[PDB]
Amino acid sequence: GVFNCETETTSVIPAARLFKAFILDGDNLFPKVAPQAISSVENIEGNGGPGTIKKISFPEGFPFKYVKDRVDEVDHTNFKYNYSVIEGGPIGDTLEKISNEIKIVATPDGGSILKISNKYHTKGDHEVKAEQVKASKEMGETLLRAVESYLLAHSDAYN
Amino acid sequence: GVFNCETETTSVIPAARLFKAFILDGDNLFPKVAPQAISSVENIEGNGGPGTIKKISFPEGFPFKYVKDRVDEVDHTNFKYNYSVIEGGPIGDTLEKISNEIKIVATPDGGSILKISNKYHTKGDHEVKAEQVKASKEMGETLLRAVESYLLAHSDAYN
C-alpha cells in the first residue's frame, strides 16, 4: 500500500545557505548539532550523490539502532534532495521503504520554506501508524532546527 | 488516549486580514469559496464566541454528512482560535473529541504563518488512523487556500 505525508516548515535561513548546510554537509553536521538524535553517518557504498547508501546510527537510547538510506536525486540548483529509507529502523514486516523528498524554496524576504514529502511503501495491506508518521516529521524538524541554530551561532558558516 | 498533530502553513496574506476573513467571517466565506467542501455553517447555540455550537454541513458527496463544533477560545488581538469537533463526522466509537488550535502569526514581510494543532481524544486505547489525521490537515489547507485565493481576487475585502 501507500501513504503520502506532505508537510511544510519555514526557516529564517536563505535557501542556498540552508541547502549547503542541511543537505550537502548534513553527514558532518547532524552528529555535531543533534548528538541526542544522530550518533554517526557513514558511507556504505558511493560518494554522496545519487545511488549512495548511507548508514545513519542513533545514540544509545533508541528503539531503532540505525537505518540505511539511499540517495535518489540531488539538484544543486533548485535545492532538491530525494532519499529513501531502505533498511533498519521502521523498515520490516509492515513497511518496505520510505521515499522522501525535500525541496528548499527561497522566500522574497531571504528565508526559506521547506516542502517535505514522506511516502510510505507499506507491505501489502498494512497501514502506517500515525505515531510513525509523526516520528519521521519530528526527526526532520529536530534536525532542521538544530542546523538553523548552528547557522545563526556561526554567521560565516556555509556562505 | 491522545494523539497530537502540530502543523504549520504559510500565507502571503497578512495575519490581521487573514484572521478577519478565515476565522471571523469563515461561516460566511467557507460555503462561498469552498462549496465542494462545505455546504453550510449554522448556529445551533450561541453567538460565535466561546461556547458557541455550530453545525457544519458537507455537500452531497461525502462519507460524513456534518459535524458539530464548539468554539472554545477566540483572541482577537493575538489571532488565536480554538474549537473542538464534538459530534458527527469522525466522532464516534473510536474518538471522543478533536480539540483544535489555530494561531496566525505575522511575518516581518507582511505575510503569515499558521500554527495549527489537531488533538485527538481517542476513546480508551484506540489509535487515530494516519488517513484521518491527514484528512483533517488537508481540509484545513483546502479552506485556507480557498480563502487566500478569494482575498487576492478581492483586494479590498477585509481591510
Report the 3 state secondary structure along chain B.
CEEEEEEEEEECCCHHHHHHHHHHCHHHHHHHHCCCCCCEEEEEECCCCCCCEEEEECCCCCCCCEEEEEEEEEECCCCEEEEEEEEECCCCCCEEEEEEEEEEEECCCCCEEEEEEEEEEECCCCCCEHHHHHHHHHHHHHHHHHHHHHHHHCCCCCC
Residues of A engaging B, defined by a Cβ cutoff of 8 Å: 3, 5, 7-10, 107-109, 113, 127-134
Q: Which residue among B5, B113, B130 sits closest to A129, beta carbon to beta carbon?
A: B130
Please indicate whether, in this complex, the C-beta atoms of A134 and B107 are within 8 angstroms of each other.
no
Cα B86 to Cα A62, A66, B9, B69, B72, distances in angstroms: 37, 41, 25, 6, 11
CATH code at B100?
Answer: 3.30.530.20
Q: Which residue among A3, A7, A8 sits closest to B130, beta carbon to beta carbon?
A: A3
- Give the total number of structural domains in chain B: 1
- Measured CA to CA, the distance from residue A126 to residue A141 in angstroms comes to 26
C-alpha cell at A152: 545563526
Closest Cα in chain B to A128? B130
Please calculate the CA angle B131-B135-B139 and round it to the nearest 5 degrees. Answer: 170
Sign of CA dihedral B17, B49, B134, B55: negative
- Nearest CA-CA distance, residue A89 and chain B, Å: 19
C-alpha cell at B33: 469559496
Please indicate whether, in this complex, the C-beta atoms of B9 and A9 are within 8 angstroms of each other.
no
C-alpha cell at B90: 469522525
Resolution (A): 1.2
Q: Please choose, from the candidates B90, B84, B57, the residue with its C-alpha nearest in 3D space to the C-alpha of residue B71.
A: B84
- Experimental technique used? X-ray
- Measured CA to CA, the distance from residue A86 to residue A74 in angstroms comes to 18
Chain A interface test: which of B10, B11, B119, B125 (most A C-beta within 10 Å): B10
Closest Cα in chain A to B134? A5
Helix (H), strand (E) at residue A139: helix A130-153
C-alpha cell at B20: 478577519
B129 contacts in A (CB within 8 Å)?
Answer: 127, 130
- Measured CA to CA, the distance from residue A115 to residue A99 in angstroms comes to 14
- Nearest CA-CA distance, residue A50 and chain B, Å: 30
Cβ burial, residue B104 (10 Å; 0-12/13-18/19+) = buried
Please indicate whether, in this complex, the C-beta atoms of B128 and A130 are within 8 angstroms of each other.
yes
> Residue B69 sits in which domain range?
1-159
CB atoms within 10 A of CB A120: 25
